[PDB]
């Protein structure tokens, strides 16, 4: 009962959003990229700047929703690749070019709020899913190994978007395999295993969605 899309070729390298609040842009590209591998047999790095700069419904470097982002790609008839529209770290004039198009999107599906069971099915039958979490605890910052669980995690204090690229079981503790966007040094090679089926810890299942490519 398990999957790690990292061995599946469903996930690109770990990126570093730096000092821009565009975690939501990385989250969405991950999902789009997982769905690209899924459909065509290969992937590439998609463009979060394109999202930072062009998702008007989002707040650029000041936060945003991946739902808005999936919808943008669809309405926009695509999104660029990393090469065509490169991450710069700050919000700028939308510079989208149809020549860079490297993924399409034709809608999205939100997971019923808080239903971890359903998120486990979407990860299984769909792929890497976009989720959001409380990442404000210190324990999270210094996360290194093992299965992250902290009692002060507030599922009502959502403040960071990430990516669920799998789920498994370690030494008897169930887990979500989470790709973050703080660089590959952060956590464990840029990843953190976050408790699963533990009362929706950190709100892992409160804001989960995915694109329909
Ligand atoms: C990232 N980085 N941003 C700032 N966080 C974020 O957008 O969190 C919500 C709004 C919950 C998606």
Swiss-Prot record:
Catalytic activity, reaction form: Broad proteolytic activity. With small-molecule substrates and inhibitors, the major determinant of specificity is P2, which is preferably Leu, Met > Phe, and not Arg
Keywords, sorted A to Z: Cell membrane, Disease variant, Disulfide bond, Glycoprotein, Hydrolase, Lysosome, Membrane, Protease, Secreted, Signal, Thiol protease, Zymogen
Main location: other
E.C. code: 3.4.22.38
Any one GO CC term of the record: lysosomal lumen
Membrane topology note: Peripheral membrane protein
Active site as annotated: 23, 160, 180
Gene Ontology BP terms: bone resorption; collagen catabolic process; extracellular matrix disassembly; mitophagy; negative regulation of cartilage development; proteolysis; proteolysis involved in protein catabolic process; thyroid hormone generation
Tissue: Predominantly expressed in osteoclasts (bones). Expressed in thyroid epithelial cells.
Protein location: Lysosome; Secreted; Apical cell membrane
Enzyme class, first EC level, given as a word: hydrolase
Single GO term (MF): collagen binding
Disulfide cysteine pairs (residue numbers): 20-61, 54-94, 153-202
Stated role: Thiol protease involved in osteoclastic bone resorption and may participate partially in the disorder of bone remodeling. Displays potent endoprotease activity against fibrinogen at acid pH. May play an important role in extracellular matrix degradation. Involved in the release of thyroid hormone thyroxine (T4) by limited proteolysis of TG/thyroglobulin in the thyroid follicle lumen.
Protein family: Belongs to the peptidase C1 family.
Medical condition linked: Pycnodysostosis: A rare autosomal recessive bone disorder characterized by deformity of the skull, maxilla and phalanges, osteosclerosis, and fragility of bone.
Name of this chain's protein: Cathepsin K
Included stretch of the parent chain: 117 to 329 of 329
